[PDB]
Design a protein around this ligand. Structure first.
Ligand SMILES: NC(=O)C1=CN([C@@H]2O[C@H](COP(=O)(O)OP(=O)(O)OC[C@H]3O[C@@H](n4cnc5c(N)ncnc54)[C@H](OP(=O)(O)O)[C@@H]3O)[C@@H](O)[C@H]2O)C=CC1
Ligand SMILES: NC(=O)C1=CN([C@@H]2O[C@H](COP(=O)(O)OP(=O)(O)OC[C@H]3O[C@@H](n4cnc5c(N)ncnc54)[C@H](OP(=O)(O)O)[C@@H]3O)[C@@H](O)[C@H]2O)C=CC1
Ligand SMILES: NC(=O)C1=CN([C@@H]2O[C@H](COP(=O)(O)OP(=O)(O)OC[C@H]3O[C@@H](n4cnc5c(N)ncnc54)[C@H](OP(=O)(O)O)[C@@H]3O)[C@@H](O)[C@H]2O)C=CC1
Ligand SMILES: NC(=O)C1=CN([C@@H]2O[C@H](COP(=O)(O)OP(=O)(O)OC[C@H]3O[C@@H](n4cnc5c(N)ncnc54)[C@H](OP(=O)(O)O)[C@@H]3O)[C@@H](O)[C@H]2O)C=CC1
Ligand SMILES: [K+]
Ligand SMILES: [K+]
Ligand SMILES: [K+]
Ligand SMILES: [K+]
Lengths: 312, 312, 312, 312
């Protein structure tokens, strides 16, 4: 497998670079940054090589700038983490506009070079996935974002720590926006494979507070250590593992909707099977009326931003 | 296994925390920092939990300050990365004196709490291992530093990339000081288990350039990306994997010499077996005339610092 | 960890020996057989060692007869696969009686040597677990059998292959007897973490035929290949993995009931958490009315055999 | 990766099928046998599926007879373990003739269907590799046998157990015939990367006895348990892991010589790099006078048999 990472000079991109280089199937990794940051990438490469010597793994790493995009051609996957730091004097809309310009430029250049799969991490992840889709002119299954996957994993942590179980014993799914209008699917939450509603202690779960913790966790980590790096990198690792061996894992990822669930012209976190050819939306799942109404509200929340940045 | 990490607020300590929390046998992790950095640790913990949800692993993580050292009792291992940033005007001896005070204080406090193993990463690593040994009053096999292990892994990288082979195909051992007096053991360098001196292409290896590259790599990464992160953490992971399952791996780690090789009252990188009870020096290995001379010189170099910081 | 395997001369026992010797935490493995088969075990040991050389793993393997039980003392776990072939003229009760003698003899000898955990594979597995419990006099959480775990995994396979999903995507739980009275828990079946009943395609699943397949799979593999070996060995590996790192995985294993679900004096497959100290029955799960009724019937069926062998 | 196994109904082929199906990169496995043994393969398939459910792995397994060779087309690799048991009345030449007919027939049928790599396990492994190469008309880098690799691994075990070290700490290389004329490369024997001749304890190594044990291990395992299973399967696994991720591991495998080391028209165990495109002989290695004389003798020994079976 061949993976390029645009934004490897940041903390998230660097953690992703390290984790993916360590995967046995990742034979070639391409780190891409602005010209001024090339040296950072050169440091990262060396660091990662040292790390591989310790983990008994191997990889060949190339470095290029974000204009020529050399070595990008032929990539099975391009992960984009490039994004501006949102200053306190900015709105969600300001961040959306600026990062939309960045993501659209990169998507157009990538589409000019080759056909590949785009994995968007830049926030607002749903809106940036939408921008990447429209500007790349790729097939919609080839463009997806981390979206609510991270949220699901954080929710998992909460559940696992409240019930005092191994974190991997918990599975959960969150659909909709990677934001305050996210819709956790309690019906799709389980421990040891058993639905969480089948537990008598389920009544003791402070679900409302837990969901608020999930919605706030990104801001919390920003305030405490300056932002997440390992969490999102490992979520990306999980998705990439599904892609590399064509596992078709049922996850929640942001992708473009062309009629599914009665919605169109919007990117949102939905149930998807992730495999070598990208993302297939799973419509075979049945939602409760409450969950579907919250999902509708979330999609309509995303669409305002998408409309605002579509043609930038 | 229970591991405490004093200095997890730094980049090396953070990466070590992430990697070790991911190990299935590390069930308890204690992150320790100065009081003002507690919030950083609180971010790290959350981040790591998120990452574990992505890697299908699990851990219980606690946070404490570097004065109370709460939760440290019971640790099978204590890794110390705490250290002062070396300013441009500081010599190695100035750094040694400052960090020797820090390391000795931590060692005294830990020895007051319990008996455990100490894994010193703070530089100059040989001298800090010495200080930890003498201040802790622990058994010598219980006190060791990364030493020349990281140098050996970096040498592995250089060789593998020169000959174009998988990094894990190369094995090499470097003994002596983690510094300019390090002694590469070409007699114990191999590719595919084959001594490197049995390859006709060995004559083509620019050995002097490669060794200089290894000696200067820390500074190079400092200048390129701000300092090493993943390399050191993965080297620590390799050592800890040998410890957890009592593999008695033959590595080069810094530890106190009490007669081996005709030296005493010094810490230096030597071939050791790494197991659940610590490091055991391997004196059964035979060095070339030249390699033993170089190792003697390096030992003297290290002792000149150890004598200056012993009683601080 | 230290594991003894009584019955390693058979195919299931040999596969279990190979898989467990490869686990990094399994540092000592004791192979035990009747005297006449000691040579077989010797061969097995050599074979396994060669295999470890290929897998880059390690283990120390000892051999001993089933009378001295040398090297067994100190074992964290003892797995028993010794059993007689069921001939066409044998009733299920005839098999239970003949194998109860074997299991009870071994259990009494083991309890005379030391206290340990007993993992019973010999069929009829529920009845043999009961016999092991009464003859060892061990605490009930220390004695368990594979029970409906294998059936569970087989059910998983069926579902996955019908829906064309990765096998690890499916989770299911089967309780009751390891036999025709087993009770599949559709309320605890899921694909990608989503309850299977929330898929619109669930109506297409031929559940009755699949359950008959699971019930008959043992005999089918007997008729095709001469008996299962890899399936049960891997199921045992899954259980041991939960034990070794105290994961408390929620599985279905057979263990003695002392009041749970309104039953006592019987061993049956039930939800359990699997840890370093054995199995803890989980009563916090709520089955459907029909499922609990069928579970009651199955426990009665099992108890009828347990009463016949309690005094044998 | 797609792998076919001709001979999966035997014990070595069944163990290989289990191990390879468990590998994440092996998405499709084809089991091939004589028509009469097809049911056995069906059994094997079900068994392996059950095992995958326990290991959290996945695979698509197909079954076919050895005449139509259905599903074989498109295989990246075809492993041949088909061979008749050596009865006490047959000499090595008799066995070679019979198995040469089997191997040549299979090689021609495979080449008739598609181009692929052939991995020969059938004994005499060097002679059967020679026969497969000549009858398939494939490029020589695409045809290789396990050869002395297994021997090397067995030697590893011996060395490790003598020095009381973890098995993975030892590396060794044996070249020449998979038989009594094998040539151990003591220079290429190491512990922790340290050449074995640089240990003072090397004087105590009963080297000749260990070599005789290695030469006789196959017969010993046959006499004790009826033949090797897991050892050869794991050796195959190691090679296949090199192939699948193009690691180009430096191993000793049997392959056709066309001038390397001064020999031609023979298959023998030689140092090779094993990758996605097959084996590349490493002529860069230099042997001592004694090593080369032993290797030349072994080559002549093999050539006799090869000439006897070339036209069968
Ligand atoms: N989906 C999710 O759950 C998550 C989303 N994110 C998002 O990912 C992005 C990256 O986060 P993080 O790695 O922590 O951020 P950093 O600030 O550490 O890194 C930012 C990256 O973006 C690049 N960049 C910044 N401005 C520009 C620009 N104008 N043009 C091109 N490249 C630019 C930087 O390059 P340079 O070095 O030259 O400045 C660097 O590669 C953010 O938008 C963040 O919100 C992060 C975490 C989780
Ligand atoms: N042995 C080897 O091969 C290697 C050695 N190292 C050494 O590891 C150490 C850590 O490096 P790195 O993580 O990059 O450094 P960082 O600056 O990123 O982190 C330094 C750490 O030390 C703490 N610290 C700083 N000043 C003091 C002080 N006065 N008393 C106590 N603790 C203090 C910091 O706490 P706070 O956040 O509160 O400031 C933080 O936890 C250094 O000594 C470095 O040279 C690194 C790599 C390889
Ligand atoms: N729980 C489950 O889902 C499964 C249960 N099983 C059960 O596991 C057991 C082993 O199966 P399998 O490995 O295929 O059987 P094998 O016939 O291959 O091996 C039988 C084992 O039992 C020993 N044994 C046989 N007779 C006696 C006796 N009279 N006294 C003592 N030991 C004896 C054999 O020793 P020796 O070599 O000396 O004959 C050998 O170790 C059976 O009871 C089987 O039904 C198996 C698979 C699945
Ligand atoms: N290179 C090495 O280091 C090693 C080599 N080997 C070799 O591997 C081979 C297999 O050994 P093992 O698995 O233990 O043997 P088994 O007897 O267990 O299996 C034999 C296999 O060969 C098939 N077979 C036998 N006779 C014929 C025939 N006339 N035509 C076609 N297929 C036939 C069998 O098919 P069926 O079921 O229809 O009879 C079955 O698939 C042997 O040649 C053995 O010497 C083994 C171990 C190590
Ligand atoms: K890699
Ligand atoms: K852990
Ligand atoms: K082991
Ligand atoms: K597979």
């Amino acid at each position: 497998m061949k993976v390029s990472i645009i934004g490897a000079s940041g903390k998230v991109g660097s953690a992703i670079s390290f984790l993916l280089a360590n995967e046995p199937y990742v034979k070639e990794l391409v780190l891409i940054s602005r010209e001024k940051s090339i040296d950072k990438l050169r440091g990262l490469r060396e660091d990662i090589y040292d790390a591989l010597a310790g983990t008994k793994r191997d990889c060949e790493i190339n470095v290029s700038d974000d204009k020529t995009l050399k070595f990008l051609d032929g990539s099975d996957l391009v992960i984009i983490t490039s994004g501006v730091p949102r200053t306190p004097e900015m709105s969600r809309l300001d961040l959306a506009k600026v990062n939309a310009k960045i993501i659209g430029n990169y998507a157009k250049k990538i589409a000019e070079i080759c056909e590949t799969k785009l994995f968007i991490i830049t926030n607002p992840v749903d809106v940036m996935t939408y921008k990447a889709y429209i500007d790349s002119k790729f097939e919609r299954n080839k463009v997806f974002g981390l979206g609510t996957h991270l949220d699901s994993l954080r929710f998992k942590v909460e559940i696992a720590k409240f019930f005092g179980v191994h974190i991997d014993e918990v599975r959960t799914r969150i659909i909709g926006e990677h934001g305050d209008t996210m819709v956790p699917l309690i019906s799709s939450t389980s421990i040891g494979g058993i639905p969480i509603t089948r537990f008598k202690s389920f009544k003791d779960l402070p679900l409302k507070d837990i969901i608020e913790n999930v919605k706030n966790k990104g801001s919390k980590i920003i305030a405490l250590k300056g932002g997440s790096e390992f969490g999102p990198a490992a979520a990306v690792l999980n998705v990439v593992r599904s892609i590399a061996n064509n596992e078709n894992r049922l996850l929640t990822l942001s992708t473009y909707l062309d009629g599914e669930f009665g919605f169109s012209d919007v990117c949102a976190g939905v149930p998807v099977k992730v495999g070598k050819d990208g993302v297939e939306i799973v419509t075979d799942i049945v939602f409760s009326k409450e969950e579907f109404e919250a999902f509708k509200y979330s999609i309509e929340t995303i669409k305002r931003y998408c409309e605002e940045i579509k043609e930038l």
